[PDB]
């Protein structure tokens, strides 16, 4: 996989500030017809600065970020099913190895399922040895 | 020896992909295939089998008899209404019977073994005066308890000593 | 229990208990009763818990 | 400049991540049944530090000033309050001021 | 696995050659490492980390080794992590006002 | 009373025969049952035998030990599983129990001291012999040397009392009231250490964190009570001197209880946190005891029984978790509700009892010490409110933090809870509730 | 090995799971479990608690309550204060006259 | 009878007032109902401080009836949404959820004070007794102002949920075929229509008498009318309006955070005791 | 049974009472045996004043007697509390007029109780209680009744 | 049918423990009930004479 | 209910087609936004916001840089919902 690198380009700082600015805009003006109206204007303010020097842009983000924080909503919207959401990761699933400690009679209620897991265990070791050099 | 796991050698099979973030960042083709296989195994195409062994290993002899009688009416009625309908009648004919005998024992206790002056423990009842209203017997009714000995007698006025 | 939902079992118990208590509350309203039963644990210094 | 430093740490932590997965899903160590955890120096250092502090303690004045107001004066001021209040209350009783009608907490 | 006596902090670092080994000893590159002031209540050569807005302000979407603590594999732990933990005195964003 | 003693003595050889570990507890549990039948005691001493009697005060404390010392054998099944000098281990407890039975059943003050400390050495062997971590040395000495340092001067105070009273017997001592300032400090500073008091508690977090599970039981179960039991016998003839210096002890313990509760919140070790919780409650016990009122005395006796069973109980659970997770730190131990959900029930009930939750016997005793302290001075309401508030602040942190969150990541596979563990937990908590029914007996020792 | 769909559905009565009392001898493990339950529960808790309840009145607390009623009736009828404020009658006592005291501290 | 009556009345009045305003800024469905519950608790505590038991007891039972129903309605609504409590996502449920919306409407009106529902019999008599006794001028205003606020947020919730145009996500599980959930609700729903009148004939063996001028007896209805319109009308919006909540940003944040009580009690306090734990153990248990 | 429900109420009370009375009369009472139990009587023993300062048995005799009398006196207060307890429940709403005499009996008993056993704490014994009385009486003749202060 | 294996810790030990405890508590309850029933019904209480 | 992969392919393209600053012809599984379709960075941000609302979650700003073609977005949503069919 790929682990993100902490260094963030100035181009990305503007990107993030734009995303936060719009999401904050939704909270204030919930309604889509109003939101789309105001969101369009918000995009305009960025295009009237797109043609500027970076060092000038450094001044823009500073006041651009502060005014956002100075205008943060008192109850910002989130998505209930994701990080920070009210309903995020409600359930916790133990690690797989729990199943292997069932009483042998308990396992008899799902003989097919435990039959398969032990075929997978044979495959898993060979998979693990190759990946990490055993 | 006593094998807790019963032979089956405990391990972890799911690997990285259980955690959501570890999936989004990236997954090699083999991992994706493995992850797809894992989910396909979690599907069960039958309900749990009924193991006779548990039903005796988790029912003590006392319980197997203490319930024996009312399980005969479950056996008698289960072809008349279906196992679900009949068993509900077995559960409510039984659990309700305990309640009926529960009140009577409670009703009995508060009628003879209520706390008296010769013990400290036991439930002690001090009821109030019923609202006497016109039409009731002897409307100008008065509390018969006047002297201090009347109050909190706890059956002491009628003791022999 | 093994074949009855604990919610299904629970509901009938509480409602019947609730219904019975409702009848009593009517009875206590009519007579304006006050009953005060109490069980005693321990006593000392002319006191009682 | 400092950008490389951020990259130095990244690849540095990256080796740690790879090593963790090897131990984390180690079938052979899970295979023990012994139970326990992946060996983590970070927790080990923290746990050990939490226990030993006298080694690095010194009566430096800041510590004395910290410790002084921390417990000693709350104890001293409050122990003084208890002695004061009871002495005043006690004096009435010894003098005979309070009739037995008015004595509080008769049964205590 | 070792024991506490094999992991307790060393005495406050006094030299650059000593700092570099100390930073090595905690899996830190030599620039993060910063011992406590050693007024006399110091924790020895133990690093000083966190003390900011708190644990919950760390990036949630990063693929942590220990998501539950929001910590990596061998990374050290702040001496006051028990106070700036996610459930203790911490916040996701800076407070609006003083 | 000799029925108990000679029963224990002839159970000593069972340590030597092999495959007799489990036959020992049954003999230890059965004797508790036999002892449980002979309750006909009163405030005054009864069942005299050559120097051994028992009143209502001594009875409950004796019966507490037999129960606790019997649970030690259940808890420490690992010693049997690895044959780790189990025979010697058994002999340590059988000897230790005998010293306790004599200590409480002794009728003369000199004897109480004679077996008071003598029980220490069997405890000291227990820590060094079967403790895991290297610090059992540096915690072995603290337990031995704090106690000896303050018990040896007590021996002088005991002998000085013969030359005035002419005897040690407790009843004959109560007829006197002494006025010497130092003598007061030579019979209470020796027990204030073992309670412990807040400023001289430095041994308690070390002994409990390092001692084995069984040593944790008895250290938290009976050793903290020998200090409490001793005071109840020797404030009878220190009433006059107690009034001049009580306000020093009350303030320290009360303020000590609050400050330790904050220290509990900043702990990160299960064993440490439970041990510091012992100092918190023992501060209330000592505080009410020195109030000397009828309530403060009966209540203190009650809470000592209840707290011992609970704190002993909570040391079971820490051992259970430590046995599998392998680490006793809070960071390792998380979300155990998702590994051992059946276990988490017992965590709650024992935890709830520690915070004076009903209907436990703990709340009955705590209501009383609170009454005596308030009557002693209305200024005591300030921290006594704080201490009861924070006494739940860490208990929730202990329970919630260790049971609720998401599971640890690095933990390797481990066994689930066994029937032995569940049975152990029941015997800890279940009496702690049913005892409320017959508090008649384990309360009115005066 | 490579267990089958019936080795999980036909539980082998060969290996066993321990109840925490022993890990080597199966019959021993069950044997200790049974006896330990009997004494701890069937005797200490069931028989003990039963016997406790019917324990004779050893503290003389039930007996008192009988006195508290009889003793109250006799003296409520006798024209005497319901609780006597004197441990022994004041007239029976012989006070040391003032000259005897000689400034001895008197407390209430 | 004592000075505590003076204090309890003041503290209760603020509680019912504060959440009355707070309910008009909160956006979580689950929370708005919670502040609604808390707001009416202050109403009991205040009338209770006047010295009336049946009035407090009567309203208490009434509150339990319909307030339980409201939460049941919320649970069905939320479970059909993607587990999101926010009202800004919901909308147009009066047609997508016929049965549940109908179950809510009765409960909400009972809170509103539509005559001869469960809530009306309790709220009415309470407000009438307030205007009959010797009250404080400040307390009287809060009593009637809260009723306006009580209806204000309640229809504000109507707009964001039923009358408002739908504002959900692309994939919506809108459905109202959960009979097992619904059957239990109709138990409460029946009671919320008769719970009021039934208890009036039972709770009060000696009914209270009231005789007040028209221009105060009608005040309870009139404010409810103003509140319902004011809450509904202001909830509307257009393209060229003023975000009054945004403009008075400082005030909205104050009223939208329940007067910073969560901050005061959770972030303005816990810092201090926990540090003290370190200084003690740092300087005594391993120091002095 | 002028009320409808009260007519239904009595119907149930017949159902729960009918069996238990029969069961009590049919099985329990008829099959039991006749047996009598008595009431402990304690011969008064010499007070602590007669006891010498060197003998312990005589002190032990009085200390136990003092304690038994304490229990009787602890709960003679308890009985008087229960009377005012019961009158308040059996006479409400007009209970102030009727409980007022009972409370007067109660408050007097408490003071006499507190004059005798009061302020001794635990470890109160015959010697201590008697010695409080001696000091109390001396103060009475010198400074008059307590609560008036000293001279 | 169509159900998904949801992984949970074993309950057998706890299930067994609840059974064993219930057995042995009953194993004592029947005797004491016999005695207390025998005592109260046949021997009965004394009479305060 | 399960979110089939084919639907994800449909749902993604539906949103993109509705986006008015893109070509319905060039628009395909393999096209690039900033390279082929001439999307700006700010334009690329708005697209992700639509994707978030489309499926109901947050796409982290750090991880949005991997999403340079609708196939990647399709893969991303599939990974999050672990629908590999
Ligand atoms: C709120 C709670 C309400 C009160 C409690 C509700 C439950 C009521 C239980 C039964 C009440 C009762 O009759 O007497 C109880 C019984 C009377 O004892 P007692 O006061 O000493 O004797 C009363 C007189 O001496 C003699 O007078 P007596 O006529 O009352 O004699 C008693 C006689 C009365 O006969 C009856 O019990 C049956 C009467 C009702 C039958 C229904 C007839 C209507 C049809 O027989 C008994 O009561 C035998 C006691 C059986 C107890 C079994 C408990 C353990 C099993 C439960 C698990 O007291 C007890 O309950 C103590 C037993 C508990 C031992 C358990 C120890 C743990 C192991
Ligand atoms: C908060 C603290 C609560 C502590 C426990 C409160 C008491 C609850 C039960 C009281 C009770 O057991 O009923 C007594 C009565 C039993 O009789 P009894 O307790 O009233 O006294 C009769 C004589 N002895 C004590 C010997 C039994 O009822 C029962 O115990 C239930 C039936 C028997 C089991
Ligand atoms: C429940 C716990 C509270 C019990 C209260 C109680 O102790 O009983 C009160 C009452 C005794 O009142 P009492 O003065 O003795 O009336 C008869 C006078 N000769 O005892 C009574 O209950 C008598 C009054 C009868 C009231 C109605 C009938 C009793 C119903 C009891 C509940 C069962 C209802 C079952 C409903 C089934 C619904 C499906
Ligand atoms: C009264 C005065 C007399 C008191 C009693 C005096 C005798 C006490 C010692 C009796 C036991 C002697 C044998 C013994 O030590 O027990 C056996 C065993 C010791 O260990 P081990 O070396 O394995 O012994 C092999 C011999 N069977 O056993 C053990 O493991 C522990 C034995 C106890 C050690 C106590 C020291």
Q: What are the Cα distances from residue K53, in Å, to H84, H167, K47?
A: 13, 11, 10
- The closest alpha carbon to D35, from F210, H221, F412, belongs to F412
User: Alpha-carbon distance I46 to F242, whole Å?
Assistant: 32
User: Alpha-carbon distance I84 to I80, whole Å?
Assistant: 7
Asked if B34 reaches chain A (Cβ–Cβ under 8 Å), the answer is yes
User: Alpha-carbon distance B91 to J30, whole Å?
Assistant: 23
Residue among K20, K23, K36, K40 flagged as catalytic: K40
Q: What are the Cα distances from residue F229, in Å, to F109, F192, F288?
A: 12, 11, 13
- F46 phi and psi angles, rounded to 5 deg: -145, 165
Name residue D37's beta-bridge partners. F411
User: Alpha-carbon distance H70 to H78, whole Å?
Assistant: 12
Q: What are the Cα distances from residue B80, in Å, to B75, B76, B77, C2, C3?
A: 10, 8, 5, 21, 18
Tell me the torsion sign for CA atoms I56, I57, I62, I65: positive
The closest-lying atom of ligand 4 relative to the alpha carbon of residue F87 is 30
Q: Is G105 helix (H, G, I), strand (E, B) or coil?
A: coil
Q: What are the Cα distances from residue F434, in Å, to F50, F362, F438, G49?
A: 35, 12, 8, 8
B33 Cβ contact list (under 8 Å, min separation 6)? none
Q: Are H69 and H146 in contact (CB under 8 A)?
A: no
**Half-sphere exposure of I11 toward its Cβ, with a 13 Å CA cutoff?**
6
Burial label, J38 (beta-carbon count in 10 A; 0-12, 13-18, 19+): exposed
Residue of I nearest to C48 (CA): I78
User: Alpha-carbon distance A16 to A35, whole Å?
Assistant: 19
- The closest alpha carbon to F311, from F285, F290, F292, belongs to F285
- The method recorded for this entry reads cryo-EM
User: Alpha-carbon distance F118 to K46, whole Å?
Assistant: 79
Residue of A nearest to K62 (CA): A4
Tokens read off for H1: 């009878």
C25 lines ligand 3 (CB under 6 A): no
DSSP E49-91: ---SS-GGGS-SSS--SBTTTTB-SS----TTTTTSSSSSS--
Question: For F41, left (φ over 0), alpha (ψ -120 to 50), or beta?
Answer: beta
Dist. CA G53 → ligand 2 center (Å): 9
- The closest alpha carbon to H153, from H224, H103, H228, H70, belongs to H228
Q: What are the Cα distances from residue H54, in Å, to F270, H60, H206?
A: 51, 9, 10
The angle at the Cα of F46, spanning F41 to F51, to the nearest 5 degrees, equals 140
Q: After which residues is chain D broken (C to N over 2.5 A)?
A: none
F357 lines ligand 2 (CB under 6 A): no
- The closest alpha carbon to F76, from F343, F415, F331, F323, belongs to F323
Distance linking the first and last C-alpha atoms of chain I: 71
Dist. CA F339 → ligand 4 center (Å): 43
H/E element, C43: strand C43-44
* Residue E26 CB neighbour total at 10 angstroms: 19
The answer, yes or no, to whether the previous bond of F359 is cis (omega within 30 of 0) is yes
Tokens read off for D71: 């417990």
Q: Are H193 and H118 in contact (CB under 8 A)?
A: yes
In chain A, residues with a C-beta closer than 8 Å to the C-beta of D14 are 3
Q: Is H191 helix (H, G, I), strand (E, B) or coil?
A: helix
- The closest alpha carbon to F35, from F9, F57, F67, F12, belongs to F67
Task: Report CA H216 to chain centroid distance, whole Å.
Answer: 23
Ligand nearest to the CA of F85: 4
Tokens read off for I57: 């048995």
User: Alpha-carbon distance I98 to I106, whole Å?
Assistant: 13
Dist. CA B105 → ligand 2 center (Å): 13
- F231 phi and psi angles, rounded to 5 deg: -60, -40
User: Alpha-carbon distance H149 to H111, whole Å?
Assistant: 11
User: Alpha-carbon distance F69 to F29, whole Å?
Assistant: 9
Q: Are K23 and K39 in contact (CB under 8 A)?
A: no
Distance from CA of H28 to the nearest CA of E (A): 19
Helices (H), chain J: 12-38
Please name each of the domains of chain K with its CATH number: 5-81 (1.10.1200.10)
Could you write out the three-class secondary structure of chain F? CHHHHHHHHHCHHHHCCCCCHHHHHHHHHHHHHHHHHCCCCCCCCEEEECCEEECHHHHHHHHHHHHHHHHHHHHCCHHHHCCCCHHHHHHHHHHHHHHHHHHHHECEHHHHHHHHHHCHHHHHHHHHHHCCCCCHHHHHHHHHHHHHHHHHHHHHHHHHHHHHHCCCEHHHHCCCCCCCHHHHHCCCHHHHHHCCCHHHCCCHHHHHHHCCHHHHHHHHHHHHHHHHHHHHHHCCCCHHHHHHHHHHHHHHHHHHHHHHHHHHHCCCEHHHHHHHHHHHHHHHHHHHHHHCCHHHHHHHHHHHHHHHHHHHHHHHHHHHHHHHHCCCECCCCCCHHHCCHHHHHHHHHHHHHHCCCCCCHHHHHHHHHHHHHHHHCHHHHHHHHHHHHHHHHHHHHHHHHHHCCCCCCCEECCCCCCHHHHHHHHHHHHHHHHCCCCHHHHHCCC
F407 lines ligand 4 (CB under 6 A): no
User: Alpha-carbon distance F80 to G36, whole Å?
Assistant: 15
Tokens read off for B30: 């083999």
Q: Is C43–I89 a contact, with Cβ atoms under 8 angstroms apart?
A: no
Task: Report CA D34 to chain centroid distance, whole Å.
Answer: 32
B109 lines ligand 1 (CB under 6 A): yes
G41 lines ligand 1 (CB under 6 A): no
Task: Report CA F45 to chain centroid distance, whole Å.
Answer: 24
User: Ligand 4, from F9, F20, F88, F92: best to mutate by most atoms within 8 Å of Cβ?
Assistant: F88
Q: Are D40 and E72 in contact (CB under 8 A)?
A: no
Largest CA distance in chain H: 76
- The closest alpha carbon to G10, from F208, F385, B51, J6, belongs to B51
Query: CB under 8 Å, gap of 24 or more: what pairs does I35-41 form?
Result: I35/J43, I35/J44, I35/J45, I35/J46, I35/J47, I36/J46, I36/J47, I36/J48, I36/J49, I37/J46, I37/J47, I37/J48, I37/J49, I38/J48, I38/J49, I39/B161, I39/G63, I39/G66, I39/J48, I40/G60, I40/G63
- The closest alpha carbon to H59, from H110, H131, H4, belongs to H110
Q: Is J4 helix (H, G, I), strand (E, B) or coil?
A: strand
Tokens read off for F185: 């400090």
Q: What are the Cα distances from residue A106, in Å, to B3, C1, C6, F64, F168?
A: 15, 19, 22, 40, 64
User: Alpha-carbon distance F26 to F7, whole Å?
Assistant: 13
User: Alpha-carbon distance E42 to E23, whole Å?
Assistant: 17
User: Alpha-carbon distance I140 to F17, whole Å?
Assistant: 74
Q: Is G12–A108 a contact, with Cβ atoms under 8 angstroms apart?
A: no
Q: Is K63–A83 a contact, with Cβ atoms under 8 angstroms apart?
A: no
* Residue F337 CB neighbour total at 10 angstroms: 21
Could you write out the three-class secondary structure of chain B? CCCCCCCCCCCCCCCHHHCHHHHHCCCCHHHHHHHHHHHHHHEECCCCCCCHHHHHHCCCHHHHHHCHHHHHHHHHHHHHHCHHHHHHHHHHHHHHHHHHHHHHHHHHHHHHCCCCCCCCCCCEECCCCCCCCCCCCCCCCCCCCCCHHHCCCCCCCCCCC
- The closest alpha carbon to F381, from D69, D85, D98, belongs to D85
User: Alpha-carbon distance H109 to H106, whole Å?
Assistant: 5
Q: Is H188 helix (H, G, I), strand (E, B) or coil?
A: helix
Q: Are G57 and B108 in contact (CB under 8 A)?
A: no
I114 Cβ contact list (under 8 Å, min separation 6)? D100, D103, D106
Q: Is H206 helix (H, G, I), strand (E, B) or coil?
A: coil
Q: Are H166 and H92 in contact (CB under 8 A)?
A: yes
User: Alpha-carbon distance A96 to F413, whole Å?
Assistant: 9
Report the DSSP pairing between strands I36-37 and F46-49.
unpaired
* Residue B107 CB neighbour total at 10 angstroms: 15
Q: Are K54 and K15 in contact (CB under 8 A)?
A: yes
User: Alpha-carbon distance B75 to G36, whole Å?
Assistant: 37
Q: Which residues of B43-54 are buried (b: 16+ CB within 10 A; e: fewer)?
A: ebeeeeeebeeb
Q: Is I37 helix (H, G, I), strand (E, B) or coil?
A: strand
- The closest alpha carbon to H57, from H2, H149, H125, belongs to H125
Contacting subunits of C (3+ beta carbon pairs below 8 A) = B, D, F, H, I
Task: Say what angle helices F109-118 and F224-234 make with each other, to 10 degrees.
Answer: 170
Size of interface F-J (CB pairs under 8 A): 25
**Half-sphere exposure of G67 toward its Cβ, with a 13 Å CA cutoff?**
18
User: Alpha-carbon distance F312 to F222, whole Å?
Assistant: 9
User: Alpha-carbon distance F203 to F148, whole Å?
Assistant: 12
**Chain length of chain C:** 49
Tokens read off for A77: 């919207």
* Residue A53 CB neighbour total at 10 angstroms: 8
Residue whose token pair is 């041994």: F203
Tokens read off for A63: 């006041």
Task: Report CA D32 to chain centroid distance, whole Å.
Answer: 36
Taking the C-alpha atoms of E30, E33, E37 and E42 in order, what is their torsion angle to the nearest 10 degrees?
Answer: -130
Q: Is A88 helix (H, G, I), strand (E, B) or coil?
A: coil
* CB interface of B with K, residues 23-52, below 8 Å: 23-25, 27, 32, 35-36, 39
Distance from CA of C32 to the nearest CA of B (A): 6
Q: Are H103 and A106 in contact (CB under 8 A)?
A: no
User: Alpha-carbon distance E70 to F225, whole Å?
Assistant: 43
H/E element, A20: helix A10-28
Distance from CA of D100 to the nearest CA of C (A): 17
Dist. CA B109 → ligand 1 center (Å): 7
Task: Say what angle helices F239-265 and D73-95 make with each other, to 10 degrees.
Answer: 150
Q: Are E39 and D62 in contact (CB under 8 A)?
A: yes
Question: For I37, left (φ over 0), alpha (ψ -120 to 50), or beta?
Answer: beta
* Residue D38 CB neighbour total at 10 angstroms: 20
Q: Are F284 and F224 in contact (CB under 8 A)?
A: no
Q: Are B37 and A123 in contact (CB under 8 A)?
A: no
User: Alpha-carbon distance F368 to C41, whole Å?
Assistant: 14
Q: Is A3–B34 a contact, with Cβ atoms under 8 angstroms apart?
A: no
I97 Cβ contact list (under 8 Å, min separation 6)? none
F132 lines ligand 4 (CB under 6 A): no
H107 Cβ contact list (under 8 Å, min separation 6)? H66, H67, H69, H70, H73, H189, H192
- The closest alpha carbon to F196, from F273, F256, F154, belongs to F256
Q: Is B58–J5 a contact, with Cβ atoms under 8 angstroms apart?
A: no
Q: What are the Cα distances from residue H87, in Å, to H81, H93, J14?
A: 10, 11, 44
* CB interface of B with G, residues 11-70, below 8 Å: 49, 51, 53
Q: After which residues is chain K broken (C to N over 2.5 A)?
A: none
Tokens read off for H251: 């005030």
User: Alpha-carbon distance G65 to B120, whole Å?
Assistant: 7
- The closest alpha carbon to H118, from H128, H108, H132, belongs to H108
**Chain length of chain B:** 161
- The closest alpha carbon to H81, from H214, H171, H178, belongs to H171
The answer, yes or no, to whether the previous bond of H125 is cis (omega within 30 of 0) is no
Residue K72 designated active-site? no
Q: What is the DSSP letter of J3?
A: E
G52 lines ligand 1 (CB under 6 A): no
The angle at the Cα of F224, spanning F220 to F230, to the nearest 5 degrees, equals 155
Question: For D16, left (φ over 0), alpha (ψ -120 to 50), or beta?
Answer: alpha
User: Alpha-carbon distance H16 to H41, whole Å?
Assistant: 7
Q: Is I61 helix (H, G, I), strand (E, B) or coil?
A: helix
Dist. CA E8 → ligand 1 center (Å): 64
Taking the C-alpha atoms of A83, A84, A85 and A90 in order, what is their torsion angle to the nearest 10 degrees?
Answer: 70
């Amino acid at each position: 996989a790929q682990v993100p690198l902490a260094i963030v380009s100035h181009k990305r700082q503007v990107c993030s500030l734009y995303k936060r600015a719009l999401r904050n805009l939704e909270s204030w003006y919930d309604r889509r017809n109003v939101y789309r109206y105001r969101a369009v204007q918000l995009r305009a303010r960025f295009d009237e600065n797109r043609s500027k020097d970076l060092g000038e842009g450094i001044r823009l983000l500073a006041c651009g970020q502060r005014e956002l924080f100075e205008t943060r909503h008192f109850q910002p919207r989130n998505f209930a099913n994701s990080a920070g959401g009210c309903a995020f990761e409600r359930e916790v699933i133990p690690p797989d190895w729990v199943l292997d400690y069932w009483h042998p009679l308990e396992k008899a209620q799902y003989p097919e399922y435990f039959a398969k897991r032990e075929q997978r265990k044979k495959e898993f070791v060979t998979w693990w040895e190759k990946q990490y050099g055993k | 020896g006593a094998s807790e796991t019963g032979g089956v050698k405990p391990m972890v099979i799911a690997g990285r992909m259980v955690r959501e973030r570890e999936r989004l960042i990236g997954m090699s083709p083999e991992e994706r295939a493995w992850r797809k296989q894992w989910l396909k195994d979690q599907e069960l195409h039958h309900g749990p089998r009924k193991v006779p062994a548990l039903e005796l290993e988790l029912n003590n002899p006392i319980k197997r008899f203490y319930r024996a009688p009312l399980d005969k009416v479950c056996n008698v009625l289960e072809p008349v209404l279906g196992f679900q309908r009949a068993y509900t009648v077995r559960f409510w004919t039984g659990k309700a019977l305990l309640a009926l005998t529960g009140i009577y024992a409670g009703a009995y206790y508060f009628k003879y073994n209520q706390n008296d002056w010769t013990r400290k423990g036991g439930w002690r009842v001090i009821h109030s005066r019923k609202q006497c209203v016109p039409g009731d017997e002897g409307y100008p009714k008065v509390s018969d308890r006047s002297a201090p000995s009347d109050y909190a007698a706890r059956g002491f006025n009628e003791s022999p000593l | 229990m093994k074949y009855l939902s604990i919610c299904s079992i629970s509901f009938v118990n509480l409602i019947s208990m609730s219904l019975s208590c409702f009848l009593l509350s009517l009875y206590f309203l009519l007579n304006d009763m006050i009953y005060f039963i109490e069980w005693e644990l321990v006593s000392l210094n002319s006191m009682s818990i | 400049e400092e950008q490389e430093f951020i990259k130095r740490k990244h690849e540095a932590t990256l080796k740690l991540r790879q090593e963790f997965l090897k131990q984390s899903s180690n079938p052979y160590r899970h295979a023990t049944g012994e139970g326990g955890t992946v060996f983590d120096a970070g927790l080990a250092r923290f746990q050990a530090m939490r226990v030993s502090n006298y080694e690095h303690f010194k009566p430096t004045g800041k510590s004395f000033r910290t410790g002084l107001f921390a417990v000693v004066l709350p104890i001293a001021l409050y122990a003084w309050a208890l002695k004061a209040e009871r002495d005043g209350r006690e004096e009435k009783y010894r003098t005979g001021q309070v009739a037995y009608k008015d004595r509080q907490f008769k049964f205590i | 696995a070792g024991w506490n006596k094999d992991y307790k902090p060393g005495p406050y670092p006094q030299t650059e050659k000593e700092r570099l080994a100390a930073a090595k000893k905690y899996y830190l590159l030599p620039e993060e490492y910063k011992p406590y002031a050693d007024d006399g209540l110091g924790y020895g050569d133990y690093p000083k980390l966190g003390y900011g807005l708190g644990v919950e302000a760390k990036d949630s979407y990063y693929p942590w080794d220990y998501p539950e603590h929001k910590r990596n594999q061998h990374e050290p732990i702040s001496a006051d992590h028990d106070l700036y933990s996610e459930d203790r005195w911490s916040q996701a964003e800076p407070p609006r006002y003083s | 009373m000799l029925k108990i003693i000679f029963f224990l003595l002839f159970l000593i050889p069972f340590c030597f025969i092999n495959n007799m570990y489990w036959m020992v507890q049954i003999m230890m549990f059965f004797i508790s049952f036999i002892f449980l039948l002979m309750n006909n005691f009163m405030n005054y001493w009864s069942e005299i035998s050559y120097f051994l009697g028992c009143d209502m005060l001594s009875y409950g404390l004796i019966l507490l030990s037999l129960w606790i010392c019997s649970l030690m054998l259940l808890a420490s099944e690992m010693i049997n599983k690895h044959n780790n000098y189990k025979n010697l281990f058994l002999l340590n407890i059988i000897i230790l129990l005998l010293l306790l039975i004599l200590t409480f059943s002794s009728m003369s003050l000199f004897m109480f001291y004679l077996f008071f400390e003598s029980s220490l050495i069997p405890t000291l062997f227990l820590i060094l012999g079967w403790g895991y971590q290297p610090e059992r040395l540096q915690a072995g000495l603290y337990l031995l040397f704090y106690t000896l340092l303050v018990s040896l001067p007590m021996l002088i105070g005991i002998f000085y009392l013969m030359n005035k009273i002419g005897s040690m017997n407790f009843y004959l001592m109560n007829n006197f009231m002494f006025n010497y300032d130092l003598l007061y400090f030579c019979l209470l500073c020796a027990f204030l250490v073992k309670m412990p008091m807040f400023l001289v508690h430095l041994w308690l977090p070390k002994a409990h964190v390092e001692a084995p599970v069984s040593g944790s039981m008895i250290l938290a179960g009976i050793m903290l009570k020998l200090g409490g039991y001793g005071m109840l016998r020797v404030i009878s003839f220190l009433q006059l001197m107690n009034l001049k210096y009580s306000f020093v002890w009350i303030s320290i313990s009360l303020v000590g209880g609050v400050l330790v509760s904050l220290v509990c919140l900043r702990q990160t070790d299960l064993k440490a946190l439970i041990a510091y919780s012992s100092v918190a409650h023992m501060g209330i016990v000592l505080s009410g005891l020195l109030t000397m009122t009828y309530w403060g005395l009966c209540g203190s006796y009650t809470l000592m029984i209840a707290h011992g069973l609970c704190s002993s109980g909570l040391f079971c659970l820490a051992n259970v978790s430590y046995e599998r997770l392998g680490s006793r730190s809070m960071l390792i131990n998380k979300g155990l509700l998702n590994f051992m959900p059946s276990m988490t029930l017992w965590w709650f009930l024992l935890s709830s009892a520690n915070m004076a939750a009903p209907p436990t016997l703990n709340l009955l005793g705590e209501i009383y010490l609170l009454n005596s302290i308030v009557s002693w001075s209305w200024i005591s309401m300030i921290l006594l409110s704080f201490l009861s508030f924070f006494s739940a602040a860490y208990t929730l942190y202990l329970y919630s933090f260790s049971q609720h969150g998401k599971l640890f990541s690095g933990v390797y596979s481990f066994s689930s809870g066994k029937i032995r563990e569940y049975l152990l937990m029941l015997l800890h908590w279940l009496p702690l509730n049913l005892l409320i029914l017959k508090s008649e007996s384990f309360m009115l020792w005066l | 090995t490579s267990l089958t769909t019936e080795d999980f559905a036909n539980p082998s009565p060969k290996n066993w799971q321990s109840y925490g009392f022993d890990y080597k001898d199966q019959v021993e493990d069950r044997k200790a479990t049974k006896s330990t339950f009997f004494v701890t529960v069937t005797l200490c808790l069931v028989w003990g608690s039963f016997y406790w309840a019917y324990l004779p009145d050893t503290q003389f607390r039930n007996w008192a309550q009988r006195e508290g009623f009889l003793e109250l009736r006799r003296r409520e009828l006798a024209g005497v204060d319901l609780v006597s404020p004197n441990y022994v009658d004041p007239a029976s006592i012989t006070l040391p006259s003032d000259e005897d005291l000689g400034d001895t501290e008197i407390i209430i | 009878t004592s000075w505590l009556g003076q204090l309890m009345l003041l503290l209760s009045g603020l509680t019912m007032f504060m959440a009355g305003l707070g309910a008009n800024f909160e956006f979580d469905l689950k929370k708005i109902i919670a502040l609604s519950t808390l707001s009416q608790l202050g109403l009991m505590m205040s009338i209770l401080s006047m010295g009336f038991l049946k009035l407090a007891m009567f309203h208490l039972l009434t509150h339990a009836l319909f307030k339980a129903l409201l939460f049941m309605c919320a649970g069905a609504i939320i479970h059909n949404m993607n587990n999101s409590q926010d009202i800004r996502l919901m909308g147009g449920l009066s047609i997508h959820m016929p049965l549940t919306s109908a179950c809510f409407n009765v409960s909400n009106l009972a809170l509103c004070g539509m005559p001869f529902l469960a809530g009306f019999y309790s709220k009415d008599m309470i407000l009438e007794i307030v205007s009959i006794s010797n009250v404080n001028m400040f307390s009287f205003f809060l009593y009637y102002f809260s009723t306006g606020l009580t209806v204000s947020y309640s229809f504000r919730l109507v707009y964001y949920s039923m009358t408002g145009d739908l504002n959900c996500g692309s994939l919506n599980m809108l459905n109202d075929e959960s009979w097992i959930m619904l059957r239990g609700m109709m138990g409460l729903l029946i009671m919320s229509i008769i719970g009021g009148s039934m208890l009036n004939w039972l709770i009060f063996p000696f009914p209270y008498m009231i005789c007040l001028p028209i221009y105060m007896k009608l005040l309870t209805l009139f404010v409810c009318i103003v509140g319902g319109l004011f809450g509904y009308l202001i909830s509307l919006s257009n393209l060229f309006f003023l975000n009054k909540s945004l403009f008075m940003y400082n005030l909205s944040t104050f009223l939208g955070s329940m007067w910073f009580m969560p901050y005061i009690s959770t972030y303005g306090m816990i810092f201090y005791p926990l540090n003290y734990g370190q200084l003690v153990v740092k300087s005594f248990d391993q120091g002095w | 049974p002028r009320s409808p429900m009260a007519s239904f109420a009595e119907s149930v009370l017949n159902v729960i009472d009918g069996p238990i009375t029969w069961f009590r009369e049919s099985i329990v009472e008829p099959n039991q045996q006749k047996q009598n139990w008595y009431h402990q009587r304690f011969r008064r023993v010499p007070t602590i004043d007669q006891c010498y300062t060197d003998d312990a048995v005589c002190r032990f005799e009085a200390d136990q007697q003092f304690r038994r009398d304490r229990m009787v006196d602890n709960e003679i207060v308890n009985i008087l509390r229960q009377r005012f307890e019961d009158c308040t429940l059996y006479e409400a709403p007009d209970h102030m007029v009727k409980c007022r005499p009972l409370m007067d009996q109660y408050e007097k008993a408490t003071e006499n109780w507190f004059i005798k056993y009061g302020d001794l704490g635990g470890y109160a014994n015959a010697k201590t209680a008697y010695m409080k009385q001696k000091h109390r009486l001396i103060w009475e003749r010198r400074h008059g009744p307590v609560g008036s202060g000293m001279k | 049918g169509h159900h998904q294996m949801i992984i949970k810790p074993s309950r057998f030990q706890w299930d067994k423990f609840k059974d064993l405890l219930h057995f042995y508590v009953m194993l004592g309850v029947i005797p004491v009930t016999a005695l207390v029933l025998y005592a109260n019904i046949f021997v009965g209480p004394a009479q305060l004479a | 209910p399960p979110l089939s992969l084919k639907l994800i392919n449909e749902r993604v393209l539906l949103v993109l087609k509705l986006y008015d600053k893109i070509d319905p012809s060039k628009l395909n599984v393999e096209s690039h936004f900033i390279n082929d379709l001439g999307l700006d960075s700010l334009d690329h941000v708005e697209v992700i916001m639509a994707m978030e609302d489309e499926f109901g979650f947050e796409i982290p700003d750090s991880d949005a840089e991997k999403l340079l073609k609708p196939a990647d977005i399709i893969k991303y949503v599939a990974d999050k919902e672990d629908v590999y069919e």
